[PDB]
Amino acid sequence: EYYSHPRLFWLSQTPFEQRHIVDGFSFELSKVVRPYIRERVVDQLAHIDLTLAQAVAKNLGIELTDDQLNITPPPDVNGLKKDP
Amino acid sequence: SLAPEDGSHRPAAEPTPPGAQPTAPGSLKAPDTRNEKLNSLEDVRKGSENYALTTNQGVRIADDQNSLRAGSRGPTLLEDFILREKITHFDHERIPERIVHARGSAAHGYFQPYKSLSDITKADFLSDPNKITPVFVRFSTVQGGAGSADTVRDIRGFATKFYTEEGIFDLVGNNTPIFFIQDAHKFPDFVHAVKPEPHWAIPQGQIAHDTFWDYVSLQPETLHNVMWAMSDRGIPRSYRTMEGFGIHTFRLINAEGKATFVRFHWKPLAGKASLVWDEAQKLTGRDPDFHRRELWEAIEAGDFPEYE
Amino acid sequence: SLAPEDGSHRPAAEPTPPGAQPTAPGSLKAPDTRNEKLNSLEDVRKGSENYALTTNQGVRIADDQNSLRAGSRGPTLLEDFILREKITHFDHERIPERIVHARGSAAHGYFQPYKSLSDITKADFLSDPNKITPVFVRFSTVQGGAGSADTVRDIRGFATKFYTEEGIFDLVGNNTPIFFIQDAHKFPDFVHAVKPEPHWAIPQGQIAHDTFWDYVSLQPETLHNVMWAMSDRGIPRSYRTMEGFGIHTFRLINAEGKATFVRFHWKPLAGKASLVWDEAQKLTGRDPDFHRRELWEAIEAGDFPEYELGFQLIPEEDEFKFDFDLLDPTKLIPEELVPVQRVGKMVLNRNPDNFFAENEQAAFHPGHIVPGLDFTNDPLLQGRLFSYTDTQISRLGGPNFHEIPINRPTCPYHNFQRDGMHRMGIDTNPANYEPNSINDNWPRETPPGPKRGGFESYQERVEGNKVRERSPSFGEYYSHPRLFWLSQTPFEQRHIVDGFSFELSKVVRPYIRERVVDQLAHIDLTLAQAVAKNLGIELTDDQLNITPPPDVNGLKKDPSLSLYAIPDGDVKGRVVAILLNDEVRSADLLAILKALKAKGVHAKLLYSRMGEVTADDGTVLPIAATFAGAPSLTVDAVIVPCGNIADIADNGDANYYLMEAYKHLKPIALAGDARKFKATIKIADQGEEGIVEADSADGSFMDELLTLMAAHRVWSRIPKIDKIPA
Amino acid sequence: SLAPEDGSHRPAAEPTPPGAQPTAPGSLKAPDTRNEKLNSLEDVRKGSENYALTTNQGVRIADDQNSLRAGSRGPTLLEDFILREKITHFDHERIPERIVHARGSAAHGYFQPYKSLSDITKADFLSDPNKITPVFVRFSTVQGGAGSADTVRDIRGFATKFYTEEGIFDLVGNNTPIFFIQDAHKFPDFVHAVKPEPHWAIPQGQIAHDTFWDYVSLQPETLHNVMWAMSDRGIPRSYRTMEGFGIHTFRLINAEGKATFVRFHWKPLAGKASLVWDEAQKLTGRDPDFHRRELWEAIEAGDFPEYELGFQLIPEEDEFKFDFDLLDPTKLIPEELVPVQRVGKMVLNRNPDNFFAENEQAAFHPGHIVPGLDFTNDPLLQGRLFSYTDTQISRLGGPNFHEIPINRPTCPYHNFQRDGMHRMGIDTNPANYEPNSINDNWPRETPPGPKRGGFESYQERVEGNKVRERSPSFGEYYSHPRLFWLSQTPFEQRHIVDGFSFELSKVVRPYIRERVVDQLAHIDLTLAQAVAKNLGIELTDDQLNITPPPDVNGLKKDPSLSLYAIPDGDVKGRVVAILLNDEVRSADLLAILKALKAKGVHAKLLYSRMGEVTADDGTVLPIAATFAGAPSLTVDAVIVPCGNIADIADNGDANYYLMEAYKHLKPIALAGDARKFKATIKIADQGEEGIVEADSADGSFMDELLTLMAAHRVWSRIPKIDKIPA
Amino acid sequence: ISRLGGPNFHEIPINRPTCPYHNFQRDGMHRMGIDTNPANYEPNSINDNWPRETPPGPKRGGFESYQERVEGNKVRERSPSFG
Ligand code: HDD
Ligand code: HDD
Incomplete structure (x- = not known):
């Protein structure tokens, strides 16, 4: 199981810490020369959190599919939806 | 005599703020800072003042400015053993750097418990709050070589050697609470993916390249630590202002033989703090030794790194 | 299949401009580029497409995702040899980096002379304009580690391995025509001074620290190369846009036995171009791999690095005709006095396949010369000859480093030498000694001669006592730094001032700054006051009155010393x-x-x-x-x-x-x-x-x-x- | 300085009897003897005849008799790079010898099976009677250094490297069917006890010393192999006239996944033959190279050493059916209980070219198995799997030891491992990791299956707690020594008695001799008395009343344990x-x-x-x-x-x-x-x-x-x- | 350098001098001595140039080679006197 901890981490960050995460992914993936790799990473982010995946995608000039827009979020961690 | 008359070549042996004095070897800066491990190193410390310059065999050198030659414009002679020993030693100075965490900065210190933990572990170093355990701690990045920059976006290592009365315990942690991968058999694959790519050995100290993201995209188990590295966690302000973690579940074992599962943490008493990306990247150019410098200088100033 | 259906994972096997494709191993990017050395590496090249994943023993691996454990949540078992071989190889990947020039970037290429130089040298690689010699070239900085940044202020190395028909010749030079010191015995002192300081191992890739400037202040022989390093020469735009020099006077030996003194040059056919300091410093942060990248990408684009080999030639009888000693590696030979004669062209046209195997493991050494070349008594060269064979014993694991594929001669090599760690060659000779009768004394010695002869040293006259003494002819420190300074345009002079000023600001102990300012006052007063001013130092009356050093053999300047005085720009x-x-x-x-x-x-x-x-x-x-x-x-x-x-x-x-x-x-x-x-x-x-x-x-x-x-x-x-x- | 006019310096390249011609490198003596491994070494074989003597850089040498000096009575100059390369290579010839089995003698040859064994194993090398597998075999003693004597009293090693189409398999065996100790954790204790004592490094090549007998007296698990060592098996006539044994129980795995337990045997087709002690001891002085010489000469003569591979096979269901544990390497499986099935013949038919390159640098390791084979939990084998890969890192200078030519697979090998000291392979794969998309994931994992499949371990059930405990089933030490004793002829028994008596007479501390005689009293009272009498010791009444251990599964003897009870003479x-x-x-x-x-x-x-x-x-x-x-x-x-x-x-x-x-x-x-x-x-x-x-x-x-x-x-x-x- | 694993073989106990030894040499495999000198080069001002060179003299002086006269050409040649 690969997405619920990334998600718990994401949701525990402040809104500026989330912006910096989006920025880090966007900058990083801009430096990836093979565009399919950037897309496959965006696919992964859509399994973690749609808002994150969309904000990174916008910066890369990628458009989420319907499918990607419909991936169910992973479950909470033992009933936690954040830990400060 | 080459030193300045006024003695301004020598830093004072008292705590001083960053930039107030030239930095110095620790036993010269802080000679009365002691612990059992620093004292035990006294057998191998070598001084220099007032001693004659010698070969490694103890022979006093008269002229350390010239090779032996036939005529003062002549060829160098094979019998110049002084030159060949000095150049042999130089020629062999380097040893292989660490495979990972080759870039790192280290200091001596001590650990003391807040109370006896004997109800949950028989580890002698945790048995009594009056038990003082010398430590040596090395903080590090992961990917770059030993000559790489400090303020990269990367995971940091946080390794502590506890010189206990019942053996060395090394607690070899990082600054995030998980790792990228599940099973050791994949570590050379992950590490090769993050390291400089094999055709042209670029990039140094950077995860921003195709092979890293190729591996991530194919191995979703990475995504959790990749989140941490993409956050400002990946660019600490200082080794003094980041957390540490053992990452693995280990066991404590008490005198009864009862096992408790444990995960280890270090909590920075200076608080948590990170750079922003533009500042960190630019800082690898303006001062690639920023973290190493600031650790050394905090200690010199008496801003001792403290962790719980 | 993990590759995308459209094949966009694979770079086009044809010349493409930087950024257009991902970069690739050179035999995959440019399979059609060849030369004798690249062809001879074919026996060790290994592919990968369509092959099974194996151990190094050739056993196919079924599951390369997991360790062998007792139960899928159980302990890992010691019998897992596939895990332990893979982790063992990983654990022992690294070898010591080079003691100096640890940071470097290399390419394959070839060299050809414009005409036969047989009147002045019997060196085979120079004997025929049709004789093409493969080369391997590594460019480098000096101070930083292998993982340090490219666009530092430092000297650059420029080392060329010529795989000749009569042996490997290594021309191991830098991008400035002199060095910092006169005698090899001082190399570890100088290098420890420029290197990160020993208590805390700071700073990396930087000469801007106390111990470097302490050494310079106490050793004025250094000031000449320091002037170069403080100029924009210290921050080249590209390895393609810098000069190369052998620094030392060597000798050419012709078939008649006549010796001619020579200093070697490389002229960049893309011209001379450097960064500015703020740019260079910031670029070590934005792209610490900029020069390595730029070299690899030029080659991928077909912007091949080209250089012209040139010789300054001095007849034996003119040894003493100059104001400086020809054996003094802190002195340059001004081109106005001895012109550079064009010799040949070198073209770098293929990147390596594997950086570690070809670049990191390459071993260059200026003692690797061939019949038709010889040394002189330059006392820095003399000690180099010891160092480069010695250092390889630890760096590359033993005495068989010439069997590492990149280092191998393409010409024959046979001798009575045996064994040593990781010995590859399996000698069938019944004899391992000579003279022998049991193999009719093969392989046999070969007399010297005009071509294909044995090496014999030129029979130079040696006369004097066994001394540790500097030649008094070397004890002049200021006239060459002066000629260099006066040869620079006003903007290049400003950038020199700014280089010393910025560096000395990073020296913590003020007296060291003052001592360096005093040295500068012995070179040029204008230079010295402009630096003093930036440091808040006032020259004394005495410093104001130091007579400047004399010109060099009547020269008030030589514009060949400037990067920009004579335009030689190339936009390609x-x-x-x-x-x-x-x-x-x-x-x-x-x-x-x-x-x-x-x-x-x-x-x-x-x-x-x-x-x-x-x-x-x-x-x-x-x-x-x-x-x-x-x-x-x-x-x-x-x-x-x-x-x-x-x-x-x-x-x-x-x-x-x-x-x-x-x-x-x-x-x-x-x-x-x-x-x-x-x-x-x-x-x-x-x-x-x-x-x-x-x-x-x-x-x-x-x-x-x-x-x-x-x-x-x-x-x-x-x-x-x-x-x-x- | 040359060859006699008659050609008498050069051996005829024909089979010749011992002494008829000087011995020579294998490729010169028997050039038409070939196999796939010998041929694959051609890239590194180097000739000599007609070639010029050169430096390692390929520069021809004119005078290999003199150093470069300033006048012909003057000092040697540092610029003599020819002298220093030649002396540097000489100075670094040696590598560490093997920790154990440092003294050994090796040859090339071939193996083939008599019939397909596909019913019991999917190992490719055992699948077809007409598919030939090259081998390299090294025989050895255990205790002494690489320059010790051959005809010592010791165990012999018998290691075979099989270069199969599906990987290297190394069967790393000895000449007795058990070892001295049960668990690998004790190997350093035992080895240190047998090796020269640490204060003075005496004795070489000999177990007749206090520390060895101290260990033996305190660890009765050793007694079994001690009995073999004290018999004339300790002193073979030739490596051609001894048995080989893998010792451990291993597994064969067939295409259906069925595991059969197996112990490996080699049967000498020249018959079993040993020296007598006085002869063996005097021969270590008269010719300390007698076994190395005799092997090399037999191969030169056409007396190729031949061995038959044999397996003892035990179905899984029969693991617990004997009175000993099958996983206990101090126990043998008597042939009267489990017969050796003939499997195939190995012939050694060519000597190496260079002893150091091919013998000294060979690396054998019993963890080098192939699909169709697998391990068991034998706790001595289990720790061997760690040791052989580990030791090669220092011995052979790093993790690229499989690239040293003798060690190379002749089948394909490809993986994502990179770098390491003296890396030869230049990888062109864009990827150095998997999974990867950039090279479409090549080289790829391969599922297990009937032939050409990936390696998967047999899924043995493991159930137990993490313990450092010896299995109680291993705690029996006398019954196999006894079976061995009772299976010898009367003269072989006399020679055992003589071996113990001579050995203990060299133990300086008399209580150790006494404690050893007490052990013997637990094996056989007649043995113990005959040894005691030679030592002037008298057995107590209590010793005289020790009950003999039980027979081994009803056996009072097994004549396959004697060298001579059953004639197998062969005079050729x-x-x-x-x-x-x-x-x-x-x-x-x-x-x-x-x-x-x-x-x-x-x-x-x-x-x-x-x-x-x-x-x-x-x-x-x-x-x-x-x-x-x-x-x-x-x-x-x-x-x-x-x-x-x-x-x-x-x-x-x-x-x-x-x-x-x-x-x-x-x-x-x-x-x-x-x-x-x-x-x-x-x-x-x-x-x-x-x-x-x-x-x-x-x-x-x-x-x-x-x-x-x-x-x-x-x-x-x-x-x-x-x-x-x- | 290979036999004993590097340039610090003088630090193996049996090989150690019993008199003082100080210089500017550093690092190498298996390095035992922990130098506290601020300087690892000479000439230096930062440690007042210690440890210092010592002129030759009658006792406790620096090593200086006897100034033998050398005269000849660079040759790889055996002296006829050895024949
Ligand atoms: C006595 C010691 C010594 C001295 C006086 C010098 N060098 Fe050096 N140099 C070395 C000892 C050394 C070395 C230790 O032997 C290196 C490091 C590792 C190696 O293989 O060679 C080296 C490396 C090295 C490299 C990198 C070669 C490569 O790419 O692997 C270059 C270009 C030079 N040197 C050039 C010079 C020049 C142009 C000098 C002065 C004219 C000079 N060095 C003085
Ligand atoms: C864990 C320690 C250990 C243990 C318990 C053993 N060995 Fe071993 N053996 C080694 C550790 C080792 C080694 C240290 O790894 C050697 C020496 C250098 C080398 O390459 O392997 C070796 C060498 C070695 C050689 C020489 C191969 C050659 O010619 O290079 C043979 C024939 C054996 N062993 C056979 C055995 C047998 C039949 C054993 C038990 C029944 C055994 N060894 C137990």
């Missing part, structure tokens, strides 16, 4: 940033690129995000990088076409892009409404030299921009840069 | 001394040599000086060695033809030659007047079994001698040798 292979907006005027872009293409200048199309933008006429424009992602530091010029300028006009990054580029003296070109960006760099309404501007990008907008690029940087802009917060 | 490749006189009766020599040649038995012609003697008919006889120069220790039998016996009759060395041969139980044949020598060895006129005599050396005379040689030694003479002063 340089790169332009093109700042896009959301509706670019397509006729601007078409004209820009057509003109860039005709001169072999590259482009990168930058915007505020990745993806694409669409032009006024509907053309889709692919974006290479963001403004922040590919900074102006990495390009030679910036061009901004018209269109929807309002899109980017209050973009902080796009504005800062033009400011950084302006500060660093780069040509900037602005078309139509992009002219609005004049306000950000404070250009007057009527403009200024070095900013190209027009209603559109013609004919003649691009000729003016390309003319600025041929001149590299806009030196006349310098007094204007202090105004701008960038 | 054995060697006879022929003692010449100055007027040999040529008719005798003719008949001797004809009959020896018919059975492939070699001869050495011996005299009181070197050169030639001339026989009665004019035949010029060249002399191979003097009586003293090639002692009776080095031959299997002695023949003295008639002639001028007066010439040698009172020669001390000729007489002593027969005394030493007689003492060591070798057959002796005396023709004509040679019968006068019967007096030196006290033989009655009626003659004695073991002494062949007649008026001339005819058909019948040689048949009798040949029959005696087929029985190896004359055991019946033992009572008669205590008399003679030799």
